[PDB]
Design an enzyme around this catalytic site. Structure first.
Site, PDB file in Angstrom:
ATOM      1  N   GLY A 383      11.130   0.638  -6.110  1.00 18.07           N
ATOM      2  CA  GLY A 383      10.462  -0.159  -5.022  1.00 18.07           C
ATOM      3  C   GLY A 383       9.114   0.566  -4.406  1.00 18.07           C
ATOM      4  O   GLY A 383       8.826   1.625  -5.070  1.00 18.07           O
ATOM      5  N   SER A 384       8.573   0.010  -3.453  1.00 11.71           N
ATOM      6  CA  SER A 384       7.305   0.733  -2.935  1.00 11.71           C
ATOM      7  C   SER A 384       7.940   1.824  -1.927  1.00 11.71           C
ATOM      8  O   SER A 384       6.872   2.524  -1.650  1.00 11.71           O
ATOM      9  CB  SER A 384       6.587  -0.396  -1.774  1.00 11.71           C
ATOM     10  OG  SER A 384       7.582  -0.965  -1.209  1.00 11.71           O
ATOM     11  N   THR A 385       8.950   2.209  -1.772  1.00 13.33           N
ATOM     12  CA  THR A 385       9.270   3.511  -1.411  1.00 13.33           C
ATOM     13  C   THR A 385       8.572   4.709  -2.371  1.00 13.33           C
ATOM     14  O   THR A 385       8.343   5.892  -1.888  1.00 13.33           O
ATOM     15  CB  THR A 385      10.801   3.643  -1.158  1.00 13.33           C
ATOM     16  OG1 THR A 385      11.464   2.601  -0.813  1.00 13.33           O
ATOM     17  CG2 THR A 385      11.393   5.042  -0.481  1.00 13.33           C
ATOM     18  N   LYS A 387       5.832   5.115  -3.298  1.00 14.03           N
ATOM     19  CA  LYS A 387       4.563   5.467  -2.652  1.00 14.03           C
ATOM     20  C   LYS A 387       4.538   6.995  -2.473  1.00 14.03           C
ATOM     21  O   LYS A 387       3.387   7.857  -2.810  1.00 14.03           O
ATOM     22  CB  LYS A 387       3.957   4.820  -1.522  1.00 14.03           C
ATOM     23  CG  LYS A 387       3.681   3.258  -1.936  1.00 14.03           C
ATOM     24  CD  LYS A 387       2.998   2.788  -0.818  1.00 14.03           C
ATOM     25  CE  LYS A 387       3.340   1.495  -0.303  1.00 14.03           C
ATOM     26  NZ  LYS A 387       4.700   1.543   0.411  1.00 14.03           N
ATOM     27  N   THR A 582      10.185  -2.455  -0.953  1.00 17.57           N
ATOM     28  CA  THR A 582      10.421  -3.915  -1.278  1.00 17.57           C
ATOM     29  C   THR A 582      10.221  -3.866  -3.107  1.00 17.57           C
ATOM     30  O   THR A 582       9.498  -2.832  -3.491  1.00 17.57           O
ATOM     31  CB  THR A 582       9.626  -4.850  -0.938  1.00 17.57           C
ATOM     32  OG1 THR A 582       8.364  -4.869  -1.012  1.00 17.57           O
ATOM     33  CG2 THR A 582       9.896  -5.118   0.726  1.00 17.57           C
TER      34      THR A 582
END
Length: 640
Positions: A383-385, A387, A582
């Site tokens: 997920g975009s965690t 990043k 997400t």
């Protein structure tokens, strides 16, 4: 030599038939029943091996040092060492001896009872007595029981003490309502083929206080495996089941009377937990007087196993998922101790290990959310965690200036028209986005653009410093994480999607907690640990310390800033660095799109705990952050 080699072949074929359990085939290669020939007929040799080798669960008969000579005109002597496996262990260094008969064009074995066991003669018997080993316990980091052998209250009915017509139906209704049972089950239980009028028909294992017992109902204390956390740790701990004849054929050292781990740690640590059977395998003469003790040793109970799990954190992490699909992993990131490994939805392991119906078991398997899955050990797109990782890599290789501001217009973006209709999407239309802003608002467009600037080569160089492809040293079945299917993306879209954690990345929650530990160890990755006594293992210089000291203050703002995606966690009033995420999945069964919700959080002041939680295929308006406050309070209080 021409006939001596034929004798060597006959002996080797004899051991092979015995090893394969084909005792009739071995008996058909023996001489006639006579003095100086075979001591028994072929059927009696078949029954002799089948009774004796079957009683000891003989398996893997292997020989060595075979020597075949000549004794008379048609008599050839043979000898060899042999070893075999039994229900009492390996029987090693056996001196077998016999003679062969070369009468016609084929060579047979003058079979004697000394070819069963070396020092048997005439009508000697074999005796085997065994004592079951008690299964060891699985305990948490403070000795609390996770899997133990205790005394269980078994509710059951005796059909004779139940009634005739009317009073029988009344007692069944009374027993059904007093112990929360269906009326059709009690009647179906007492009407099974095995039941006799006076037999005790077991119905249910009751826990806690016992209500009043109507006519026919009785409580009997029986020993069995017990799981105090129940479903809260079912996937991790697993369950034990009855041992079958097929289990004994694979491993004779099991107890055909005992239990075997069918999943989880119960199966992973079955050998250490089950102990070793005690007893004696002995030869007796025609009367039951003991002659030779072949194998003997006392019983050794199973050794206990102490986990890093915190029984309270495990239960809290599981309850916070509210029965929804998801998983939660809690660690002490400086050592790697796995405090909690929760997977939801779950199954009742106490019901599995005791008595579970075909209907209740089928409901587990056909449940779309699949409670049998160990979600903490299943590979997901992070997920975009993710990043944080892309940012850290971009800071390390100088691609990302923390203060440089990208100008992003709208919620969608693509590199150029070659992407077709595909665009990277963000949720917040923030025009001026630097690194700190992108982390606070969870801006996927910023991450995608910075990943494309960085390029695949520099991006993979940073990713390869983590644990992709590595097999973690954990007693949990699990596949190594991957960056993508192949060694190259061969796609700008796939590269961009990977930048915010959702292309072909597969990282299970445990492997995520491993990667994200770099932020609690100044860029050192600390491998997770499940067995308490194990030594801490780390991996240094995964990301630069400069990147950590740049990103962690931004992760505080994800909680503290009024528009941070994890701002509801600021209600706790505790030092928190967090990052939400997400991931959109294709589904195909609903072909509408499933969305996973992620939360990463740890204490940036003392690095005492770290948490990675995810909701799989979330319901609308639900999230992992919405459910994390209780576990975060507990970890913050007890792990500083």
């Amino acid at each position: 030599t021409q006939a001596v080699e034929a004798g060597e072949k006959t002996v080797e074929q004899f051991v092979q038939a015995l090893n394969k359990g084909d005792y009739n085939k071995a008996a058909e290669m023996t001489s006639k029943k006579a003095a100086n020939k075979s001591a028994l007929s072929e059927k009696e040799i078949l029954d002799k091996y089948q009774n004796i080798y079957g009683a000891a669960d003989v398996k893997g008969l292997q020989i060595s040092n075979l020597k075949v000579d000549k004794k008379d005109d048609s008599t050839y002597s043979f000898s060899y060492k042999a070893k075999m496996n039994t229900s009492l262990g390996e029987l090693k260094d056996l001196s077998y001896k016999g003679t062969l008969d070369r009468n016609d064009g084929q060579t047979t074995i003058n079979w004697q009872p000394n070819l069963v066991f070396p020092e048997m003669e005439g009508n000697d018997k074999v005796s085997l007595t065994t004592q079951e080993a008690a299964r060891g316990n699985i305990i948490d980091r403070n000795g609390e029981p996770l899997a133990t052998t205790g005394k269980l209250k078994q509710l059951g009915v005796v059909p004779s003490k139940l009634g005739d017509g009317g009073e029988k139906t009344a007692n069944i209704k009374a027993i059904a309502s007093s112990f929360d049972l269906t009326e059709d089950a009690i009647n179906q239980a007492i009407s099974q083929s095995w039941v006799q009028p006076d037999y005790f028909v077991p119905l249910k294992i009751i826990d806690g206080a016992t209500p009043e017992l109507p006519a026919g109902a009785t409580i009997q204390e029986v020993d069995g495996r017990y799981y105090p956390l129940g479903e809260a740790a079912a996937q991790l701990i697993g369950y034990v089941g009855d041992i079958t004849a097929e289990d004994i054929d694979k491993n004779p050292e099991l107890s055909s009377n005992g239990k075997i781990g069918r999943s989880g740690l119960e199966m992973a640590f079955d050998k250490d937990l089950r102990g070793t059977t005690g007893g004696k395998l002995s030869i007796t003469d025609a009367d039951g007087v003991e002659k030779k003790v072949l194998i003997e040793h006392e019983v050794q109970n199973g050794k206990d196993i102490k986990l890093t799990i915190d029984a309270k954190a495990q239960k809290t992490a599981f309850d916070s998922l509210g029965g929804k699909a998801g998983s939660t992993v809690a660690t002490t990131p400086k050592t790697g101790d796995l405090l909690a490994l929760a997977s939801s939805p779950s199954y009742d392991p106490n019901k599995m290990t005791n008595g579970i119906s075909q209907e209740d078991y089928k409901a587990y398997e056909e449940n779309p959310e699949q409670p049998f899955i160990s979600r903490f050990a299943t590979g997901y797109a992070p997920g975009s965690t993710f990043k944080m990782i892309t940012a850290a890599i971009g800071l390390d290789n100088g691609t990302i200036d923390p203060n440089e501001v990208l100008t992003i217009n709208g919620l969608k973006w693509q590199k150029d028209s070659s992407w077709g209709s595909y665009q990277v999407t963000r949720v917040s239309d923030v025009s001026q986005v630097d690194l700190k802003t992108a982390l606070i608002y969870s801006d996927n467009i910023y991450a995608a653009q910075e990943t494309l600037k960085m390029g695949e080569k520099k991006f993979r160089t940073g990713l390869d410093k983590f644990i992709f492809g590595e097999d973690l040293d954990l007693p949990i079945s699990m596949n190594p994480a991957q960056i993508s299917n192949e060694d190259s993306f061969n796609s700008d879209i796939l590269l961009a999607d990977t930048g915010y954690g959702q292309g072909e990345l597969l990282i299970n929650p445990i492997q995520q907690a491993a990667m994200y530990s770099v932020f609690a160890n100044n860029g050192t990755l600390v491998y997770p640990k499940l067995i308490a006594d194990k030594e801490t293992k780390d991996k240094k210089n995964v990301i630069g310390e400069t990147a950590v000291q740049t990103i962690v203050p931004d992760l505080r703002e994800v909680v503290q800033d009024v528009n941070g995606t994890a701002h509801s966690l600021s209600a706790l009033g505790i030092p928190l660095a967090a990052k939400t995420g997400t991931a959109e999945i294709k589904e195909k069964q609903d072909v509408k799109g499933k969305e996973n919700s992620f939360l990463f959080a740890f204490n940036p002041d003392n690095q005492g705990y770290m948490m990675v939680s995810m909701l799989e295929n979330k319901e609308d308006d639900d999230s992992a952050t919405k459910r994390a406050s209780e576990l975060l309070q507990y970890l913050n209080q007890n792990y500083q």
